[PDB]
Design a protein around this ligand. Sequence first.
Ligand SMILES: Cc1cc2nc3c(=O)[nH]c(=O)nc-3n(C[C@H](O)[C@H](O)[C@H](O)COP(=O)(O)OP(=O)(O)OC[C@H]3O[C@@H](n4cnc5c(N)ncnc54)[C@H](O)[C@@H]3O)c2cc1C
Ligand SMILES: Cc1cc2nc3c(=O)[nH]c(=O)nc-3n(C[C@H](O)[C@H](O)[C@H](O)COP(=O)(O)OP(=O)(O)OC[C@H]3O[C@@H](n4cnc5c(N)ncnc54)[C@H](O)[C@@H]3O)c2cc1C
Lengths: 63, 972, 125, 52
Amino acid sequence: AYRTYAPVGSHRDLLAYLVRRLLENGANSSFVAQAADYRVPVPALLQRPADAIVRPQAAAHPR
Amino acid sequence: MPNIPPPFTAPYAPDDAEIAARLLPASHLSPPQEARIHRTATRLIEAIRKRLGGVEDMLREFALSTKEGLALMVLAEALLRVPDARTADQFIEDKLGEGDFIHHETKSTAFLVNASAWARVIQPGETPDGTIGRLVKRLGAPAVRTATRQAMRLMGNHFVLGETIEQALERGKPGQKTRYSFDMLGEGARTAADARRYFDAYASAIETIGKAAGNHALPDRPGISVKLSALHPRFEAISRARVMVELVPQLLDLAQRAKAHDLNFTVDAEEADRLELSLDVIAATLADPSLKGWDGFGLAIQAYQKRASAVIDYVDALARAHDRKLMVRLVKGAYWDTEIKRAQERGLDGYPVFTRKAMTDLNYVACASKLLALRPRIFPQFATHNALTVATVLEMAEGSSGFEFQRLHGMGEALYEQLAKDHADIAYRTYAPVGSHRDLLAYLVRRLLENGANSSFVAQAADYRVPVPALLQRPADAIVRPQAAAHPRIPLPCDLFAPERRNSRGVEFGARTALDQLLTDVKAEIADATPDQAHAAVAAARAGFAGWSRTPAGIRAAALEQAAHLLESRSAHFIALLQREGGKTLDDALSELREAADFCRYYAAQGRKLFGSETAMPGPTGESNALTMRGRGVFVAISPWNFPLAIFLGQVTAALMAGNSVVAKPAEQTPRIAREAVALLHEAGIPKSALYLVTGDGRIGAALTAHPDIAGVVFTGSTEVARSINRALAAKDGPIVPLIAETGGINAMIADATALPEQVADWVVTSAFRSAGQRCSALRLLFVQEDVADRMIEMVAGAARELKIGDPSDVATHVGPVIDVEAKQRLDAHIARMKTEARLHFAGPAPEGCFVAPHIFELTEAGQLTEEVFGPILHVVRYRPENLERVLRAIERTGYGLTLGVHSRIDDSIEAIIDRVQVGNIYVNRNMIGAVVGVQPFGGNGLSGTGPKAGGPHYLARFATEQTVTINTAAA
Amino acid sequence: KLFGSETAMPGPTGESNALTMRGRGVFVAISPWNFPLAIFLGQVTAALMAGNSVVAKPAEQTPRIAREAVALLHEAGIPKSALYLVTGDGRIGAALTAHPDIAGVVFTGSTEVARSINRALAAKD
Amino acid sequence: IYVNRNMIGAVVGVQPFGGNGLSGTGPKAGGPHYLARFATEQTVTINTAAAG
Ligand SMILES: Cc1cc2nc3c(=O)[nH]c(=O)nc-3n(C[C@H](O)[C@H](O)[C@H](O)COP(=O)(O)OP(=O)(O)OC[C@H]3O[C@@H](n4cnc5c(N)ncnc54)[C@H](O)[C@@H]3O)c2cc1C
Ligand SMILES: Cc1cc2nc3c(=O)[nH]c(=O)nc-3n(C[C@H](O)[C@H](O)[C@H](O)COP(=O)(O)OP(=O)(O)OC[C@H]3O[C@@H](n4cnc5c(N)ncnc54)[C@H](O)[C@@H]3O)c2cc1C
């Protein structure tokens, strides 16, 4: 099963919603953006999260 | 009425800065000129960025390498020629991307030369290998199918193709006129039969295009593009005499057929080393009276060449002298990467082309300016898909008449549509690629490099990350200053190894002044020892060892570098010797002279690193530990007849550099070059007490190697003699001394169906028959996939028939004599045997004298070749793709392991072959010969040699011995 | 340092040239009694590190230490197929070094035996 | 060569140990030229021009 949601509302509420929505479809880390970028190989999209962290002390972002 | 111009001979590679010094000021344009250009160009680009586009869009859309684009277009063409479209659709959905990745790639490429080859059950879980498998792993199978369908629309819309020229021509048919001129696919005939085929294709194209030319006058009639390399199988400067006599009547015949339909007839421009020869051919053809009263004859001129402006002058003078009107095509140039690589390999003193893109763009505009001023006698054709270039040429014409633009079908469409909307009197010619499947691969490769190139205008305009203003930067603003004309990150060939060492100088045979001077300089240019004299030589070398070993490494290195300088200073003398005593052709002699000097400079540089200072070892406090390398003693150097200067000097200078004294015994056939080399080393700084020459037979060689006082042997030659040397050394009761032995090989090459047959054929001919096959690295055994075997074999045979066999001092000679009568007898005996044992594909005609001509035999199996045969004799085995393991085993079985060639588009196949074999030198997609010092460390294993590799970083240490000095420093 | 990566050679644009170092084949390692562990292991791990498989013949006086060392190497990650211990006399040592399929010999011991080994190697075709 | 200390107990990677003449062939055990002797060189040359 999957549920599909449609955004529903008035024009006066669109801008606030569009802003929040666009940050994600534009983000480089976003899966959706990457899967649409054919420079990114399928195997790279399948890296396990644990293999990217490797070690507890690396949990926080270094920068 | 004016004089026919002298043969074209502009300087090949002048300095970029001097050219930029004239081009930069002259490119200046007033503000209103720049404003018109800016507006026109902005409008063209806006139109470009508005359909279903080109190759560039496909490469960008799927982020494809050029190799991947190539594989898909090849697969696309094969799928377009399946009789039933539903069959293709079924294949695409159900087979493609599911598996059989390499099979699909191999078959679709084989289809291009052998249509019957292309017409299973795919097991699941197949590892994705090959170009298509790797593509599938990266993008997924559905995207690959989608990319293949797009390649199919590109192949179907932008190329006019068939199995034969008749099928292509029928397909490209419009009582209408063709809206396209024909860019014919063919180039580089490898055989006489290819040259006739291309001739007939051009002739057929001209009738088809004539029957549909419409009723207007030039320039509003179709054109055909022609390549001189397609019309003659040895189209090269050294074969000029035969080219002038053979090619001209063919080119004339086609020009006449074209004139009869009042067509535009254009001779394409090819590599820089063919410029002069082509201008010779073109001039002699144009001179014929049968071409009067026709304004369509012409040629392409490449602005990326420094010589372009001079070519324009030459062409104008040609036109005035014969009172003709010419249509002249200005292009930038399609061979840039090739010109860079060739100038580097050939050790030229510069590049014939500019190395900054903006310099080409500058020179193009300057040349367009020049061409426009030669109207109306010259009708300029500006072939470019650059919107800025178009806008700039348009401004400078100040009108729209007396010239045209040109483009290739599938490129520049939106640009030129928009140009025509904004300027209704503008003419542009559109060319369609037309030809046979067997000529597609060579053309696709050249085409794809451009649509893939990052600097390419077309690629950039299709990349929306690149702002319109960036596409409109003026070329002069990118260069700024003359001294910035050359590309900062591309060294001149003489600096290719800087700062490690200098590169030897070569000569461009395609520059007649350079070749004539070399031929002139060259034309202007021994008792055995008793066994007692050999023993006295060892003893004298033993005495000189103490002082030579203690001479500082920098001093020893300086002598090698001075020897290199003297060799290059006296190259003509040494080349003459190599030709007369060695029997070598001019290119082989020059190459050997370069290699000799490269050995000196390389061992000198490695010598300083290795012997120049001690290595400090880590250790406890209060103690020092230093490792040094000292000369061993007296080395005996035994050298062969086939590289009687370079291998002679390589072995000798290595031993000397390590701090050994040397007794050198050259091959019996070549003592004169050995004696000159030794005198040169002495003159360069090698003391008489450190180097002695002893000449004579194997008895003399055995006297040297049996001597109890020698510290090592360096040997290049026969396998049997190496073992006898090894046994004589092992028999002594003294020290076990090093033996460095380089011996022969039965060198193989593997070619699959993804390899371009014309290219393989070139590389096979070179590798097997160059130097009459008297190189240790020479191809002896070709393995070729059965699907392309007939075509590959026929092409190698046809190419081998074009080789001139004869006197090595004649410039036109390709194959000189074998070294002596005994060599010829052994070769002729192997030939007689193979004739009764194996299929004969080619047996060339030898001149009277000590000559053996190229022979080609096909063996039922590799095991029929049991000996190294040191001559121009190729053996071929055809194999089935699934039986590659049998091929690899066959190669392993000989026990040799010197060189191996691999020809394939498929990286997984190449890598699998490299992983499997233990061969010393592997050459992928090029010839198997001419190892370059310090670039290809050369040497084999198994029956082929002991190591270490000559011309590599492990060689010098073998000639030396280690010493550790440990000092208790605690008292300090 | 040596086998971990290929060495890129200078050369022309449009061409790559890489130098690698590969195992030769089967090495015969012959070791003395006086350093029956360290010289035994020095010679063996050197050959193995270079990517050769090894047949090791220790001195007749000291096989127990050799067998323990070989067993330790196996446990450390050397596959059984890459390393074998053969014990015995000089005659067994001579059988190993006369074998036509071996790719090299590393030997520590007497001068006379080295020469006999060297002659046996040179005698092969 | 050992200066002002004993002549024995060569340390691996500190005193690369081995002789010449009747004493040995080289290269020295425990030194930087040893491993190469156990190996064979291979040169791989690839014409990369078709790629760019
Ligand atoms: C129907 C629906 C309803 C939703 N309702 C809500 C809601 O009520 N409240 C709400 O907050 N979200 C909500 N979301 C989630 C939000 O809208 C995004 O869609 C979601 O976070 C994307 O995750 P993913 O698995 O699609 O994509 P991915 O590309 O896998 O994941 C992206 C997410 O990773 C996280 N992230 C990115 N960078 C970093 C970083 N450097 N460090 C740590 N985390 C990082 C962010 O949460 C980001 O959204 C909803 C989504 C859907 C589809
Ligand atoms: C109909 C037609 C016929 C042609 N016939 C021929 C022919 O007979 N012979 C031939 O050689 N060419 C020929 N060409 C040219 C070649 O095919 C390319 O199409 C052309 O060079 C592209 O130039 P441009 O103005 O389209 O593109 P751009 O993107 O403006 O220019 C690219 C060009 O710049 C040059 N270049 C790239 N990098 C550098 C650099 N670092 N330093 C210096 N220069 C650089 C190259 O020549 C390259 O092709 C022909 C082109 C057409 C359309």
